[PDB]
Design a protein around this ligand. Structure first.
Ligand SMILES: Nc1ncnc2c1ncn2[C@@H]1O[C@H](COP(=O)(O)OP(=O)(O)OP(=O)(O)O)[C@@H](O)[C@H]1O
Ligand SMILES: Nc1ncnc2c1ncn2[C@@H]1O[C@H](COP(=O)(O)OP(=O)(O)OP(=O)(O)O)[C@@H](O)[C@H]1O
Ligand SMILES: Nc1ncnc2c1ncn2[C@@H]1O[C@H](COP(=O)(O)OP(=O)(O)OP(=O)(O)O)[C@@H](O)[C@H]1O
Ligand SMILES: Nc1ncnc2c1ncn2[C@@H]1O[C@H](COP(=O)(O)OP(=O)(O)OP(=O)(O)O)[C@@H](O)[C@H]1O
Lengths: 511, 213, 40, 27, 107
């Protein structure tokens, strides 16, 4: 049949239709091709198609041979063996000529036939199939998993014409396979109603078919084992298991620990650069974000300024990278990436140059994009002694900052640092188009608002803190504020406020 | 005539339970229920772990637990032979009885055990290796084809153990051929207590041990 | 550059073809023919 | 295989038996 | 007829005492107590050190101190061979009499 689902296979409707259109169209057509090969990853049904094609055509029973079985120690027996194998159709061709049936030969694991002895055996088969006497009643189907280890000569035209392929099933194919292998369960009512096949099809990814069957078998096994007690002497529910109903829990368990996939996946870490969100502890944050939005719209709309850059400056422990990430996510450009020194530990200068070049090469392809670079001074490692740093990465940056992208494309660049004077000394402060400033907490009112937003000290403690602080100014970074709060939250309720004030005084300084 | 205490494995109490759950449940329930289920029995177990953990003990005890004929052990790479095309015959001679019986008694036959040992001495990556005359690739292909081929066999169980799984070839580790992949490992205080108790039982039973231990 | 140290080799023989029994068979057959001719 | 060599040997054993038979006839 | 002063080794008292304690102590006690205790004998020894100290002498003397079959001495890499699967056939020949006699005479 041409249904492709009656015989117990799914996921390759188009390939089956191609097989029908290309291979056997001539035979069906009112009154040829003599080479077929199959190759695909392990799993997805190949032997099934072999057996089905064996019983499909109104042809004689196919012969099944092995891969490494055509051999023998005594020179002479292998040649006689192949001769015996191929002797079947000779008599039929002799006695019936053109008006003869079709012969199907199945070679299993043919990859072991091509590699001295292997040369002669491949030559014998090669001559027999495509030699002086052309037989139009012989068809050979071979299958492998590693086509790389096959000879080119075996694949020339006139010998192996049709070269199909198999592939990992899609969601529809997985649903078809699950239907096929749960048909019996549904027919005998042994499957519970709470199970939802759509959820399983959505959840499972790239199981290549065989793993789906394994998962179904594992779920059956666990549902079967729930109704058996073994220790002293094996015993089973007997009658009570006659109503054994599988549950969603079994398909859950069989998926999370066993029946794992044979392939991998990827991971993302974009959540690591914001851990406490953003709180409006003061006016300047809104100003910074509004300026970022203006820059984003400027890069989006302009036509004769394709490249735009900005610099974020602020004393240490002032959350510059957090604002950089937030402004990056606000724009919602198609392509966004963050180049940070955390990945590159122990690298030389050349590796850093290559990494930056790769990131920018990726960024150039898309239409419009934005890139952010954080902690420049650590990227081109800097030490006040000497000073000392790298002169290759610096030039790479100074060149990449004023290189226009391909025609009709847009790139935005943001940079964050905490040492502006040094950058102005190296002359890199000229490249950037404009700069923005990130301040520190200055007035006690902003501090009190910050504590109120954090919600860690109550009205009495807050009043005491206000009395002790309103007559003073402050200079503190938000990250350090969180650290100090955590440090002072470790004492008993009696010493918390006094400890916090003591720590603030100890770290208390002026700009 | 069996009892979990008779084998004498200490510190591996959940691994054996998992193996019994996932490999021998199908063969114990009434045939009619299984036939209604239409499931196929597993045909492979793989074990690995650092030296001196209990793998071979598990294999021996599993072989002794069941019924029918005793297993057929293959000590390391004792299959290789110098004559051309003679290793394949030695590989194919192992499955002769299984093939014959499955052909003769349909789906009401006994059980045959095959215990491969130091499996990584034969089954290396097909494309790997160098020009060693190519015998190893032909061995791997023959084993792969015979374990699960066009002709179907469903009354054999194969156990394999090793010390470095990553060198086995992928085409062998897929559901159907060798599914369960355990990992025997170092014990913990409870396992250490169980092992110490196991190995000192008879001394306690014959009054050969002092009261201060 | 890196010069390969050299190489080492492994061997795998094959069955021999003595084909010497047929000579004895042929000699015996010729003797058969001689005796058969004499008997007539 | 060695089976071929054994088959040749049996062939020749039968030939020797025929040799003895014909020698007896001539005698 | 054995006596420590006969074998002629000097400066290796403690090492020999330790080896004799760990290795040949199971096989000298009356069998009944060993069976009751239910233990398996030790089947290995490794000796190492700098050149010229007395390893091979100890091995040879241990060879001429027991009442059993003569040792099978292997001189370096005697067991390699050019053909395929002929080193393994050489190795398996050493553990040949042991297996058959174990299966024949039990314990
Ligand atoms: N799409 C599918 N439809 C039906 N059965 C499938 C499908 N995918 C996998 N299977 C199951 O997996 C196996 C199909 O693979 P098969 O036995 O033909 O081996 P193969 O992967 O082609 O061979 P090899 O090990 O040589 O690569 C059977 O158990 C079949 O039940
Ligand atoms: N309004 C805010 N502005 C900035 N960061 C904030 C704000 N509210 C909360 N945070 C949190 O404060 C932390 C800021 O630490 P971050 O590492 O960004 O500081 P930094 O001074 O830019 O860094 P570095 O000193 O390592 O260059 C982040 O957890 C951020 O989520
Ligand atoms: N879990 C265990 N419980 C009881 N005895 C154990 C256990 N593990 C090891 N033993 C003891 O150790 C020996 C068994 O070693 P085993 O054959 O399992 O080693 P292995 O890991 O297969 O070694 P190798 O990697 O060298 O082949 C026996 O003495 C057995 O009593
Ligand atoms: N304890 C000893 N008492 C008496 N003679 C000794 C002693 N140790 C070594 N010798 C002398 O030195 C020789 C040591 O030879 P032996 O083979 O032990 O050296 P080795 O360390 O095994 O050799 P290699 O350096 O190749 O390892 C003996 O033959 C003997 O003459």
């Amino acid at each position: 049949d041409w249904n492709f689902e009656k015989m117990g296979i799914g996921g390759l409707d188009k390939e089956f239709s191609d097989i029908f259109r290309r291979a056997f169209a001539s035979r069906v057509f009112p009154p040829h091709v003599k080479g077929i090969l199959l190759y695909g990853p392990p799993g997805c049904g190949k032997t099934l198609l072999a057996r089905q094609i064996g019983k499909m055509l109104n042809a004689r029973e196919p012969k099944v041979v092995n891969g490494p079985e055509i051999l023998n120690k005594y020179v002479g027996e292998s040649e006689a063996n192949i001769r015996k194998l191929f002797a079947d159709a000779e008599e039929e061709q002799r006695r019936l000529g053109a008006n003869s049936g079709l012969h199907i030969i199945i070679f299993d694991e043919i990859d072991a036939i091509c590699k001295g002895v292997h040369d002669t055996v491949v030559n014998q088969l090669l001559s027999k199939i495509d030699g002086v006497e052309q037989l139009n009643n012989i068809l050979v189907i071979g299958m492998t998993n590693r086509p790389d280890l096959i000879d080119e000569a075996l694949l020339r035209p006139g010998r192996l014409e049709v070269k199909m392929e198999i592939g990992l099933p899609d969601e529809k194919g997985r649903l078809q396979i699950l239907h096929i292998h749960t048909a019996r369960m549904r027919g005998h009512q042994l499957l519970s109603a709470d199970v939802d096949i759509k959820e399983l099809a959505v959840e499972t990814k790239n199981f290549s078919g065989a793993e789906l069957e394994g998962l179904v078998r594992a779920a059956q096994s666990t549902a079967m084992n729930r109704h058996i007690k073994a220790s002293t002497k094996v015993e089973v529910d007997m009658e009570k298991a006659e109503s054994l109903q599988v549950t969603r829990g079994d398909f859950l368990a069989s998926l999370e620990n066993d029946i794992k996939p044979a392939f991998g996946t990827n991971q993302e870490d974009y959540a690591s650069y914001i851990m406490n969100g953003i709180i409006k502890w003061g006016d300047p944050v809104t100003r910074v974000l509004d300026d970022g939005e203006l820059l984003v719209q400027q890069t989006k709309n302009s036509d004769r300024t394709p490249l735009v850059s900005v610099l974020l400056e602020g004393p240490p422990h002032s959350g510059k990278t957090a604002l950089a990430a937030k402004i990056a996510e606000e724009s919602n450009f198609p392509f966004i990436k963050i180049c940070s020194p955390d990945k590159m530990i122990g690298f030389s200068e050349t590796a850093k140059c290559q990494a930056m070049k790769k990131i920018f090469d990726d960024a150039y392809k898309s239409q419009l994009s934005c890139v952010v670079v954080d902690d420049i001074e650590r990227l081109l490692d800097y030490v006040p002694i000497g000073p000392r740093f790298s002169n290759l990465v610096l030039q790479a940056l100074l060149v990449l900052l004023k290189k226009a992208p391909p025609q009709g494309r847009k790139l935005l660049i943001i940079g964050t640092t905490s040492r502006k004077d040094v950058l102005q000394e190296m002359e890199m402060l000229n490249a950037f188009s404009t700069t923005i400033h990130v301040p520190n907490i200055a007035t006690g009112e902003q501090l009190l608002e910050a504590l109120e937003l954090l919600g860690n000290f109550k009205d009495k403690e807050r009043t005491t803190i206000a009395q002790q602080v309103k007559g003073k100014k402050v200079w503190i970074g938000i990250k350090k504020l969180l650290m100090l709060i955590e440090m002072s939250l470790q004492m008993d309720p009696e010493y918390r406020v006094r400890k916090f004030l003591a720590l603030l005084r100890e770290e208390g300084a002026s700009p | 005539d069996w009892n979990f205490e008779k084998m004498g494995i200490g510190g591996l109490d959940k691994e054996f339970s998992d193996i019994f759950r996932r490999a021998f449940a199908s063969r114990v329930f009434p045939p009619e229920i299984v036939e209604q289920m239409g499931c196929k029995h597993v045909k492979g177990i793989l074990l690995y772990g650092p030296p001196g953990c209990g793998k071979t003990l598990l294999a021996r005890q599993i072989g002794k637990m069941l019924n029918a004929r005793e297993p057929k052990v293959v000590n390391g790479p004792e299959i290789l032979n110098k004559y051309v095309g003679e290793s394949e015959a030695n590989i194919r001679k192992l499955f002769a009885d299984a093939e014959e019986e499955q052909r003769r008694l349909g789906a009401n036959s006994g059980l045959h055990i095959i215990i491969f040992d130091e499996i990584d001495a034969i089954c290396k990556q097909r494309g790997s290796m160098a020009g060693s005359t190519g015998v190893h690739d032909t061995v791997v292909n023959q084993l792969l084809s015979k374990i699960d081929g066009v002709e179907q066999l469903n009354n054999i169980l194969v156990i394999g153990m090793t010390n470095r799984p990553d060198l086995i070839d992928e085409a062998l580790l897929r559901p159907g051929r060798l599914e369960v992949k355990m990992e025997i490992g170092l014990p913990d205080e409870k396992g250490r207590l169980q092992i110490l108790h196991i190995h000192t039982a008879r001394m306690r039973g014959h009054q050969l041990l002092s009261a201060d231990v | 550059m890196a010069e390969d140290a050299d190489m080492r080799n492994e061997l795998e023989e094959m069955q021999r073809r003595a084909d010497q029994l047929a000579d004895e068979s042929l000699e015996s057959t010729r003797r058969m023919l001689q005796l058969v001719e004499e008997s007539k | 295989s060695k089976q071929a060599l054994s088959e040749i040997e049996t062939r020749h054993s039968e030939i020797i038996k025929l040799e003895n038979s014909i020698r007896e006839l001539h005698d």
